[PDB]
Amino acid sequence: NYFQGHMMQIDSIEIGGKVYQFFKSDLGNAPLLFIKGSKGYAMCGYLNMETSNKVGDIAVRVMGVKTLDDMLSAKVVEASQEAQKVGINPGDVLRNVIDKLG
Amino acid sequence: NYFQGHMMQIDSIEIGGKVYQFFKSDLGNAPLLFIKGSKGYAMCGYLNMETSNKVGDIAVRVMGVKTLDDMLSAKVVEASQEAQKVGINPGDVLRNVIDKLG
Amino acid sequence: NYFQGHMMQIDSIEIGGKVYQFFKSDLGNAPLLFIKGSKGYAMCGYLNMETSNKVGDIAVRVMGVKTLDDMLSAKVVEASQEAQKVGINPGDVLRNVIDKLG
Amino acid sequence: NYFQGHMMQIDSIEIGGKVYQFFKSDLGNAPLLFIKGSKGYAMCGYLNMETSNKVGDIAVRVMGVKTLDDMLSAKVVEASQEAQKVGINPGDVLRNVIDKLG
């Protein structure tokens, strides 16, 4: 009876006693989604890690994700320099290092 | 693995060639949801119709809804004075008069 | 160069060590805005207090507000039964009792 | 009296009779912002153009932007392959080609 032109989800989640903002929106042929804490963030494949490094962010990039669950179970593909300084490296499962983004 | 403290959904939908904004968020023991067009809006039971009338809105109030589908199939319980002026009355199925809110 | 058909603001704020979700959106001739905590919420004049009481919410209604600052400095006009049980009463300045909504 | 941990703005704007979704959110040391139409999107420096090309999006990347106005007046730094196919090229002012994203 209707057409959905655009969809967005904004959720406040708590992990290990820390609060994070999960966002998901249609963007292109793939959706855009990220999880942001007070210290850093994790984002899907649309994230340009060169930009994260340029501005000194604590950031991680994951790929092939469509949901919050997928992100938490996904392995970090790229970690920013500031993220590596706090122990986050490519290969880590996001759920295991998300605490460092809060 | 996580706790959802708050959830929000924002969707842009098209009906009869008109664009509307559907919003749903946790609020209390019942969720808050509304559909807004360029001319007026429809909202769940949390809407105070006295306020809508006070400020001259074209507004309709529906009850017992939790989703967009529920709202569109719900019957108008209260219609603002400006809404009644354009033909909307209690009893009308929202889907049948939503065009007047765009 | 463009026309703003609809505007929405979603902010995560911290007060007294507690996290709250502030939301503001165009709705009718007056905007819709609320502040929600884990236990209850405060909303502008569009809130139907009868509904809040019906579903057992801890809720407060304020009037004549357009911004977060206005809400925090506004006096509670109506307090739900559950809100009154925890000490919130009409006349209280929201900022002084917001802690009870988290 | 309060601390803003996270801020987000979601606006529905109309340009040349077409509807677009403007989004802005805190992310890292730079904000995240994009404008999305029914056919494609424009995003700030955080956009990974390699990803846009990988999935076949009609996308443009602009830099040094913080507001909707900045984006519309900004020059396209990178254009996806599908975007170039419809005439969009690096150097174009977004406002002058946004119609092709709707």
UniProtKB/TrEMBL annotation, chains A, B, C, D:
SUPFAM superfamilies the record matches: Hypothetical protein Ta1206
Record-linked Pfam families: DUF1805 (PF08827)
InterPro entries cross-referenced by the UniProt entry: DUF1805, YunC_sf
Gene3D superfamilies, per database record: Hypothetical protein YunC
Organism of origin: Thermoplasma acidophilum (strain ATCC 25905 / DSM 1728 / JCM 9062 / NBRC 15155 / AMRC-C165)
Protein name: DUF1805 domain-containing protein
